[PDB]
Design a protein around this ligand. Structure first.
Ligand SMILES: [Zn+2]
Lengths: 141, 116
């Protein structure tokens, strides 16, 4: 059973980190310097450090050498105990389902609980059900 | 290979059979690399938007499914190494699951995420 290591990354650059290390692996699997990594875990609920799969601590050091996104947490590679290989894959309740209850972030109905009606397949806009709280143009000028 | 890596981070989805995480251009030009004779999602956009959805989370760089602890837990060890997901929510309609049982493909719920 392979071990899991924790490396430090830039905040905001998790998916770019994963999509860059995957292309390094594919860019070096056929040379004289391959990569000994199995996978790299990047949860969407975290922000700041990622997870990597390797048997020994020298493999992560000889695999992440040369990347500028992982140059900060390069001098230290923490190790998790074996019971933490499972809590990493757990996701608590994507988040796109009709007839559900979402809230707003910007606009006038901030932090107001609404409902979804229809979803646009273009992934551009979404239908919402809220209640207007305007004055019907009586108080404002 | 170079085809299973999504080129752009915008408009990417994940399937409900092998949790294949790619961009919307590769599911239409090439499709599901882990199932092409049972799904046939290359050559159109209705079948790509029908089975494969965007409601998914969690990203893993599967490289050696024959030797890794995560690949056996997600039952993705008999698949091609590449971009996969760990919780792909949703369900197939009662229009493509009936043909999968008669052909010998047991459609499993890949959603390992807990509900409340
Ligand atoms: Zn699939």
């Amino acid at each position: 059973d392979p071990n899991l290591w924790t490396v430090k990354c830039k905040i905001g650059e998790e998916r770019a980190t994963a999509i860059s290390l995957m292309r390094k692996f594919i860019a070096y699997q056929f040379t004289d310097t391959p990569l000994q990594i199995k996978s790299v875990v990047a949860p969407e609920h975290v922000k700041g450090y990622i997870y990597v799969e390797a048997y020994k601590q020298t493999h992560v050091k000889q695999a992440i050498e040369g990347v500028g996104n992982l140059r900060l947490g390069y001098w230290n590679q923490q190790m998790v105990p074996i019971k933490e290989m499972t809590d990493v894959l757990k996701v608590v309740k994507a988040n796109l389902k009709p007839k559900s209850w979402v809230r707003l972030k910007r606009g006038i109905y901030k932090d107001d609980i609404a409902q979804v009606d229809y979803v646009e397949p273009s992934q551009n806009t979404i239908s919402l059900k809220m209640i207007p709280r305007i004055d019907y143009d009586r108080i404002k000028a | 290979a170079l085809e299973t890596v999504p080129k752009d981070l915008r408009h990417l989805r994940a399937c409900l059979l092998c949790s294949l995480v790619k961009t919307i251009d590769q599911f239409e030009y090439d499709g599901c690399d882990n199932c092409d004779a049972y799904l046939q999602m290359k050559g159109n956009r209705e079948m790509v938007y029908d089975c494969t959805s965007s409601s998914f989370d969690g990203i893993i760089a599967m490289m050696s499914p024959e030797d890794s602890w995560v690949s056996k837990w997600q039952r993705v060890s008999n698949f091609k190494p590449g971009v996969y997901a760990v919780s792909v929510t949703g369900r197939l309609p009662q229009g493509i699951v009936r043909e999968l049982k008669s052909r010998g493909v047991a459609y499993k719920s890949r959603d390992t995420a807990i509900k409340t």
